[PDB]
Design a protein around this ligand. Structure first.
Ligand SMILES: *[C@@H]1O[C@H](CO)[C@@H](O)[C@H](O)[C@H]1NC(C)=O
Ligand SMILES: [Ca+2]
Ligand SMILES: [Ca+2]
Lengths: 82, 83, 196
């Protein structure tokens, strides 16, 4: 809840700005998030989490049709209740 | 979005915003380049090279000179000191 | 004149050549020592880089990138790795003897590494005020080892090492309020005696 300044580097998470746009790097944990001026989240993520990380950005497999596997595990046709 | 999704695949595209009549928003002094290095040579920096072999990233940056100093582009002649 | 020796005693301390312990907890990458200083050719650029090391703990693995003879040999996680072999391989040498990684690089340069945190670079009589960095200038004068990159002596070391970070846009470390008790030993006077 405490507002901190920026940059910031605690716990292996460097919270920097790159190219006028904000970045949150976690290379120890395997991810690089960022946001632009308009607001457009982006998540670059390593191959260590292949057919793993299940969430709102889907699993990191090769296929693109099966990547709505709900928190139970259910291939749903709807992109919304997922 | 379509620009970046092709860039990530290993094939970048160039100058598409010249005629598209839409440039992404950025603060004053900078506008949207394409494939600028992340290791922006700023003012209070150490002149070291060939450690930043990182990949190339899109985003807005300063003009050819006009080094960065605290979130604004300022001319290289007026580089301050710090104490 | 004898052969001087930097060190990194623990997670966040530094012992200069001439002899000056000081406190600098950082989390970016920092120039431990180099030769490209002012008006010189710039042969070697030993660097050091820590992650999660502002508060010492079982975290804080160090990374070390040493840049001599157009090379890039670096080390972390126990082993040494060559990302770019250097030209004159004759001077190169690696002596994995005991708990250490002794590592020569020339007639007047050597490095030691205890596989965990310590960095003890040894230089010879050759230089004598040709270097600078977090280890100082190697001149014998013991109270000018805080000459920052902007060519002035500072009094507070936490503003010194912030001058020597490579990435000029990462986070500069915070001026900690001074006290004899660190975080865990703060208001835990029982434990502060068992450690003493
Ligand atoms: C993903 O996980 C499943 C279950 O372990 C496995 O059968 C599959 O080979 C993995 N990768 C692919 C190609 O789906
Ligand atoms: Ca998928
Ligand atoms: Ca000195």
């Amino acid at each position: 809840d405490q507002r901190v300044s920026m940059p910031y580097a605690s716990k292996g998470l460097y919270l920097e700005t790159e190219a006028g746009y904000y970045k949150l790097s976690g290379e120890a944990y395997g991810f690089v998030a960022r946001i632009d001026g308009s607001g457009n989240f982006q998540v670059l993520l390593s191959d260590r989490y292949f057919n793993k990380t299940c969430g709102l950005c889907g699993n990191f497999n090769i296929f693109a049709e099966d990547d709505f596997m709900t928190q139970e595990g259910t291939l749903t046709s709807d992109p919304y209740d997922f | 979005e379509y620009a970046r999704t092709c860039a990530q695949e290993g094939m970048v595209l160039y100058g598409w915003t010249d005629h598209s009549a839409c440039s992404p928003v950025c603060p004053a002094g900078m506008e949207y380049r394409q494939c600028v290095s992340p290791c922006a040579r700023t003012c209070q920096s150490l002149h070291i090279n060939e450690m930043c072999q990182e990949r190339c990233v899109d985003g807005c940056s300063c003009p050819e000179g006009q080094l960065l100093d605290e979130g604004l582009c300022v001319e290289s002649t007026e580089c301050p000191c710090v104490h | 004149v004898c052969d001087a020796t930097c060190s990194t005693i623990g997670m966040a301390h530094y012992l200069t050549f001439d002899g000056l312990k000081y406190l600098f907890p950082g989390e970016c990458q920092y120039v431990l020592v180099q030769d490209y200083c002012g008006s010189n050719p710039g042969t070697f650029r030993i660097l050091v880089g820590n992650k999660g090391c502002s508060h010492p703990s079982v975290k804080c693995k160090k990374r070390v990138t040493i840049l001599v003879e157009g090379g890039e040999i670096e080390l972390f996680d126990g082993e040494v790795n060559v990302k770019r072999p250097m030209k004159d391989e004759t001077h190169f040498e690696v002596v994995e003897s005991g708990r250490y990684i002794i590592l020569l690089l020339g007639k007047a340069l050597s490095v030691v590494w205890d596989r965990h945190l310590s960095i003890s670079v040894v230089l010879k009589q050759t230089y004598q005020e040709k270097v600078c960095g977090l280890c100082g200038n190697f001149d014998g004068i013991q109270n000018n080892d805080l000459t920052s990159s902007n060519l002035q002596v500072e009094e507070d070391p936490v503003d010194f090492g912030n001058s020597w970070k490579v990435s000029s846009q990462c986070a500069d470390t915070r001026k900690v309020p001074l006290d004899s008790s660190p975080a865990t030993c703060h208001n835990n006077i029982m434990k502060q005696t068992m450690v003493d």
